[PDB]
């Protein structure tokens, strides 16, 4: 009786949300950006090849200096690279070799990683002993760690396969805020430029906007047909792009509260592992299971280039803070640095 | 062209390459085993004899080091992490023979053996385990022998029309799991009949892993 009434009220609220989105859908991003010139053909060369990982690489993250990057591989090694000289700065042995994600602190003093052990491990890179040591091990997730991103030296937000996201206080080792509402395994998260909001994509084919300080879900975004594997914020923080297993990329607007554009092609049927914008946000770069990385025009939904240099699935990619280069990781155990030429 | 500090940073990088090379050589000589199976299939018995999110057990048998990974606690989507074990030496799958006339506690409509067969089919034919050999442990053979005297095997398999004896009922069940192998050329299935008191299970794994090691060496050497 009471349960029957409530589930009908939820349907009415969903219809109200759907009708409100259609009310503000006066135009389309394709119609607005129809008269602008296309970006042409985007050609990038493999400037560097980072060798040293002996197993499939699952995650990479650029440092804020646009020169150092950390990569996580199944060989149990967390390696920090000097992208200018291909020199290995550190090689961190992991206690669990099943790492799925890695993060680089914006200060550069810490890196994080986590995998099938349900632990987010913080590593101190600046020690008087000259080595890298575990500073914290964050426990409390009941599923695998899928993504993690530092907000500062003391706060980090993690996504887990237990359908929850958590905000951790690294000093005390306790999660201050738990983000619940996803019905599927959360696979990716992306902090906003101001680090006051973050978006996460889960296996329920939905993306949710979260308030970090308030600790509640603000907006929920749907449209994908399968699990969302990747998510990334637009440079201005008013939009984000998702990468799903349905071989599509979609752009959502926070203020419009609805999907703006879909990035799919008939020749693409494989899932999407990673997504990232360029510095200006005009180019959307997505990694795929077909061993390639496609460069998309964010405003026109036109494929502008292909980064085909990997012999296995492109598991991760990232763009530097200055937009100078893009690094792609892959299951062939190689990282490649790409940029264009005049 | 490098400066004094640039040269010493390159020397440090090659020192790191030396340890990464050394760790890979040590890793390649270790046996990685993935332990799978349904609930109450005797997986815990296998770990006890051969003694978070993933439980990892190390043991050495006849100068060979094994790494057995249990993923029974991962209540998440299997397809989101089952590719992390692509490249293991072999998969150990545990099936309880006595759980043929029983039904699932949660479902109460599907037989326990059918659940194990469905789980076996989803793992053996998985795209990440195309060439991964499977060590099939058929557990609880002593309890199965007692059960088969009273409860006929026809409850689990209606098409079964053999003698109601352990020597024949167990063989029919073994053929059902091995018939689920959709790739009978790229992989082999090693079936063993363990027990609650059987002390020859670790020997079987060593023999089965040795055959896998030989097969990998033949592929590496180019003979295969």
């Amino acid at each position: 009786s009471e349960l029957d009434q409530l589930r009908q009220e939820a349907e009415q609220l969903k219809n109200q949300i759907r009708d409100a989105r259609k009310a503000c859908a006066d135009a389309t991003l394709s119609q607005i950006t129809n008269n602008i010139d296309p970006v042409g053909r985007i050609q990038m060369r493999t400037r560097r090849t980072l060798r040293g990982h002996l197993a499939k690489i699952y995650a990479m993250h650029w440092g804020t200096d646009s020169r150092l990057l950390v990569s996580a591989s199944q060989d149990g090694k967390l390696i920090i690279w000097d992208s200018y000289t291909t020199n290995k700065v550190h090689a961190i042995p992991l206690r669990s070799s099943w790492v799925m994600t890695c993060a680089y602190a914006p200060s550069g003093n810490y890196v994080a990683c986590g995998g099938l052990d349900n632990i987010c491990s913080i590593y101190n890179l600046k020690t008087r002993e000259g080595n890298v040591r575990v500073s914290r091990e964050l426990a409390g997730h009941t599923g695998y760690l899928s993504c993690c991103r530092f907000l500062d030296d003391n706060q980090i937000v993690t996504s887990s396969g237990d359908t929850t996201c958590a905000l951790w206080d690294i000093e005390t080792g306790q999660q201050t805020t738990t983000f619940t509402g996803h019905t599927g395994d959360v696979m990716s998260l992306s902090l906003a430029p101001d680090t006051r909001l973050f978006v996460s994509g889960a296996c329920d084919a939905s993306a949710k906007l979260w308030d970090v300080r308030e600790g509640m879900c603000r907006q929920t975004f749907t449209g994908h047909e399968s699990d969302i594997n990747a998510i990334c914020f637009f440079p201005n923080g008013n939009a984000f792009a998702t990468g799903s297993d349905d071989a599509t990329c979609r752009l959502f607007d926070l203020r419009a509260d609805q999907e703006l554009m879909t990035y799919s092609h008939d020749n693409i049927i494989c899932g999407i592992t990673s997504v990232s914008f360029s510095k200006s946000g005009r180019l959307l770069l997505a990694g795929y299971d077909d061993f390639n990385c496609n460069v998309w025009d964010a405003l026109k939904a036109d494929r502008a280039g292909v980064l085909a240099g990997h012999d296995n699935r492109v598991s991760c990619l990232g763009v530097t803070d200055d937009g100078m280069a893009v690094a792609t990781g892959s299951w062939d155990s190689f990282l490649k640095i790409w940029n264009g030429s005049s | 062209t490098l400066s004094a500090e640039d040269k010493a940073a390159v020397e440090r990088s090659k020192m790191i390459d030396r340890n990464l090379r050394e760790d890979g050589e040590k890793a390649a000589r270790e046996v990685k085993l993935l332990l799978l199976g349904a609930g109450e299939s005797g997986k815990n018995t296998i770990v006890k004899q051969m003694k978070t999110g993933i439980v990892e057990t190390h043991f050495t048998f006849k100068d060979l080091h094994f790494k057995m990974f249990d993923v029974g606690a991962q209540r998440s989507e299997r397809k989101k992490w089952i590719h992390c074990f692509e490249g293991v030496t072999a998969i150990i799958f545990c099936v309880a023979l006595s759980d043929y006339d029983l039904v699932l506690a949660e479902d109460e409509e599907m037989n326990r053996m059918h659940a194990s067969m469905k789980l076996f089919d989803s793992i053996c034919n998985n795209k990440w385990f195309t060439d991964t050999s499977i060590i099939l442990f058929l557990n609880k053979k002593d309890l199965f022998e007692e059960k088969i005297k009273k409860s006929p095997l026809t409850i689990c398999y209606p098409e079964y029309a053999g003698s109601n004896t352990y020597e024949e009922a167990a063989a029919y069940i073994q053929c059902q799991f091995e018939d689920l192998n959709k790739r009978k050329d790229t992989k082999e299935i090693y079936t063993h009949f363990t027990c609650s008191t059987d002390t020859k299970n670790v020997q079987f794994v060593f023999d089965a892993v040795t055959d896998v090691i030989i097969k990998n060496n033949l592929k590496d050497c180019g003979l295969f």
Partner: single-chain antibody, 231 residues
């Protein structure tokens, strides 16, 4: 805690042989490249030898090459300096210095107490030997180099060391601009090309000492004459 202890000094006859040892503790000794730097009585800092991490690269000063031998024992965390055919010019306080070399690292960050041994090329110039200073008054110390220390990679390899009276030298500024860990922000490093300046804001009593500038652009490593600040 990081600690380097030197032993093996003492009075020796000319042409003799003496063994110096450096006991390392509190840090990953095998990951650090080790240096020997000596200081003659009432003189400046003179780099002697360097052994890289893993003992793959070894450098010697021209005045000690063929006579001094440097070696390390990573399992025992010990650094050695085998000295033969000792001259009266070798009478100096020998320091054990650790330096680690990667991108963004701070070499020469820690110095040992030093052992006294008694025996019975880019030019770095510090024209001002002594500067009379008062507490709370800003002080600038200048250094010069014959060759430009700026490299094509963008790094200017100049280091600033403060040696308080009766203590080992301590790193202040590495690569001409970066403040060493634990050094107050009132120390700043400025310069370009061949001229460099070390500026101190609100000088205190602990800032009294001799300030040395060293170049790390290429071996051999050379120090300045040392500018002394006195109350």
């Amino acid at each position: 805690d990081v600690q380097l202890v030197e032993s093996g000094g003492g009075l020796v006859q000319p042409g003799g042989s003496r063994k110096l040892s450096c006991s390392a503790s509190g840090f990953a000794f095998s990951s650090f490249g080790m240096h020997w730097v000596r200081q003659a009585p009432e003189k400046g800092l003179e780099w002697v030898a360097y052994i890289s991490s893993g003992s793959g690269t070894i450098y010697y000063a021209d005045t000690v090459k063929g006579r001094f031998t440097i070696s390390r024992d990573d399992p025992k965390n010990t650094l050695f300096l085998q000295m033969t055919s000792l001259r009266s010019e070798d009478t100096a306080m020998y320091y054990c210095v650790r330096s680690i070399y990667y991108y963004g690292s701070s070499p020469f960050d820690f110095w040992g107490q030093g052992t006294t041994l008694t025996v019975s090329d880019i030019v770095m110039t510090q024209a001002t030997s002594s500067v009379p200073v008062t507490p709370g008054e800003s002080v600038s110390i200048s250094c010069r180099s014959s060759k430009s220390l700026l490299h094509s990679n963008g790094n200017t390899y100049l280091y600033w060391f403060l040696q308080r009276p009766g203590q080992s030298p301590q790193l202040l500024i590495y690569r001409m601009s970066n403040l060493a860990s634990g050094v107050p922000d009132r120390f700043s490093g400025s310069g370009s090309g061949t001229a460099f300046t070390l500026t101190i804001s609100r000088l205190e009593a602990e800032d009294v000492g001799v300030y040395y500038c060293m170049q790390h652009l290429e071996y051999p490593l050379t120090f300045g004459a040392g500018t002394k600040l006195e109350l």
